Design a protein around this nucleic acid. Structure first.
Lengths: 120, 175
RNA sequence: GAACUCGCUGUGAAGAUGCAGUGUACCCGCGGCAAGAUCUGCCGUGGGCGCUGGAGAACUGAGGGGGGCUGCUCCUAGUACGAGAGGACCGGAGUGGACGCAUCACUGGUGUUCGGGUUGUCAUGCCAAUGGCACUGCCCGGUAGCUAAAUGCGGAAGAGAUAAGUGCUGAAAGCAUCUAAGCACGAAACUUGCCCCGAGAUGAGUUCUCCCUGACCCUUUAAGGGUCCUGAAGGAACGUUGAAGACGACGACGUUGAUAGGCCGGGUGUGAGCUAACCGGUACUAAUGAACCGUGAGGCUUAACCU
RNA sequence: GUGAAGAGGGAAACAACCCAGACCGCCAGCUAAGGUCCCAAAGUCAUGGUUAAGUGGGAAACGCGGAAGAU
RNA sequence: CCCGGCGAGGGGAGUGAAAAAGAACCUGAAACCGUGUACGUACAAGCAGUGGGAGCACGCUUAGGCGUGUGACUGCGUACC
């Protein structure tokens, strides 16, 4: 405990936290950029980078797994076609996080997560 | 007489010579260069403080660089003291390995333990404190494999050392 | 009622933090243990300052703490001693138990962050195929780590000093005597012998290394003060973080790079695929440039060295 | 007699033991009880001894023992 | 007129004897909370005061040792009803 542990706890219900991760990843990939707090931003990056890395290989099984973890027809349709070739040369680190101070409402730190290419 | 300082590579149950799986520790033997030797006149006692490993110069600051230059050796993971046998004196610069350790079979081992956070009273006493991460004085151990080619020292049983933690082995006199 | 709210001993309309004696304690905080919870008491951990030029480490180290546990067998040995019978100093070796310290590799448990089976309902235009809810819907295994039901070390030996006791020689007192003269051994009882903390030990310890080597003005005239420049060595707040962590704090990396994330490869798991936490490579991303504190030679007295 | 309704000084503090009844002030001296190795002020004074046991410096009755006590 | 948020509030100018009379509006002490001034305190134990007291800054007889502010320390000192 408190030693050699991967993934911040973010005390919540397991199914609830998985659903929130899926929804946040879908929203970020749809908008290409999101504003999320750093504690959740790091988990978002850690859970989203595997999906984009797997998107490099195009196969029926890969598409089925992507749809299973995403549950959005449009998101799966746009995946494996645009993000793959865009970052074909790059291997890892497909996204970047930049801090944006803190939220005035509840002093909550915020950070922008966006694709490294960010355009084109 | 003279000790060694290294790290715990691992701890597994290896088959004996007869062919029986016996617990054994995997301890690397790094060439510990002699940096400074104390004398009973200048400092009041005689003992040798040595260094193991090799750390990048970025971590080592320039006063420590000058200290090591005085020692005449490159800066490493740190400095470890060792009592002299009150007889022959070594020389600054040379390094030693397991070598003669295969002549006692009573060598002692010192080291730390698992990284364990401040535990609650119920789980530690069944009054809040820390367990582990303390120097260990388990003694009366027996050496198993003394292969110097691999620079690995193996002793009977388990070793008091966390994964990647520093440890020492000394020619004990107790039993 | 106000506190600059320590322990022990003695007195006490009788358990004294406020009385007499005695011992200890740098000042101020955070989390716990509740002996008497505002307070005192005990453990883990921090901020300010001192150790006299600053910083960095490495240690001697007074002092405090952990423990002196235990059954059996073996050549000794049915032998010496002992009338026969009975029956050793041995304490050298191995073999279990209660406990602490240490590690998951063997035994497995856990391992809701890995995989597979599957009931009801909803959803993807529809089948197949997937996802949410029903404790992880309910089950079968399990990566890394933690675990006892697993084993590794263990209660030394030795040394100093010993009480009782046992004594080599021997008078006062032609004897004896552990003592008057010469003058020893000796309990498992004390200390040391192994290790943890430990120079806040204010008696503030020792070793080495790096750096600061300007100027000017005033006063009540000195460890005096002030102004411009300088900002060294070293440290820390940020950025990546950890097998260190409640917060502090400690360690590593920080573009002169594997510190964290991801990718490839290898292995495990599950069942040709996914693979979280296991190992090698990879700068693809995040780790910047910068800024802040920190000096300008270190005060006085005595003695030995070349002047 | 004390306190009640007398302070102050000595006995370790101690209301009950001993000396001793404060008008006030004064940086003077002499004494009561009690002390003169210090803390804490005064002789490490003098004469002849007891005590060699730390009794002194806590212990009866009883025959030097009795003697074990305040963690 | 300016700062401020086109508010509240405040600061300059002026009126006003006076704004240390500004609509919380005569004079405005203490309890309570701050800043600066001068001193002490981070090895020292208890009704926290009492006499002694070197030092630390100032004005004084322009020293001549006087007081103001304090007390490192010393002997003593076991709240009121």
């Amino acid at each position: 405990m408190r030693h050699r542990k991967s993934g911040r706890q973010l005390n919540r219900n397991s199914s609830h936290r998985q659903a929130m991760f899926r929804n946040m990843a879908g929203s970020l990939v749809r908008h290409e950029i999101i504003k999320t707090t750093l504690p959740k931003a790091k988990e978002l990056r850690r859970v989203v980078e595997p999906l984009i890395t797997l998107a490099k290989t195009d196969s029926v099984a890969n598409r089925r797994l992507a749809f299973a973890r995403t549950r959005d027809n449009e998101i799966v349709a746009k995946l494996f076609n645009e993000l793959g070739p865009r970052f074909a040369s790059r291997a890892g680190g497909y996204t970047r996080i930049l801090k944006c101070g803190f939220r005035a409402g509840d002093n909550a730190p915020m950070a922008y997560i966006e694709l490294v290419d960010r355009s084109e | 007489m003279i000790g060694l300082v290294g790290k715990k590579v691992g701890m597994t149950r290896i088959f004996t010579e007869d062919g029986v799986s016996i617990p054994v520790t995997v301890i690397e033997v790094e060439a510990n260069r002699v940096t400074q030797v104390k004398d009973l006149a200048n400092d009041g006692y005689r003992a040798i403080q040595v260094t193991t490993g090799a750390k990048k110069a970025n971590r080592v600051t320039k006063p420590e660089a000058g200290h090591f230059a005085k020692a005449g050796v490159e800066a490493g993971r740190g400095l470890w003291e060792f009592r002299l046998a009150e007889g022959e004196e070594f020389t600054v610069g040379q390094s030693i390995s397991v070598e003669l350790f295969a002549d006692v079979k009573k060598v002692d081992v010192t080291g730390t333990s698992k990284g364990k956070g401040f535990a609650g009273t119920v789980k530690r006493w069944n009054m809040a404190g820390q367990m582990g991460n303390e120097r260990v004085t388990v003694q009366s151990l027996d050496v198993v494999r003394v292969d110097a080619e691999r620079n690995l020292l193996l002793v009977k049983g388990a070793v008091p050392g966390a994964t990647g933690s520093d440890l020492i082995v000394k020619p004990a006199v107790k039993a």
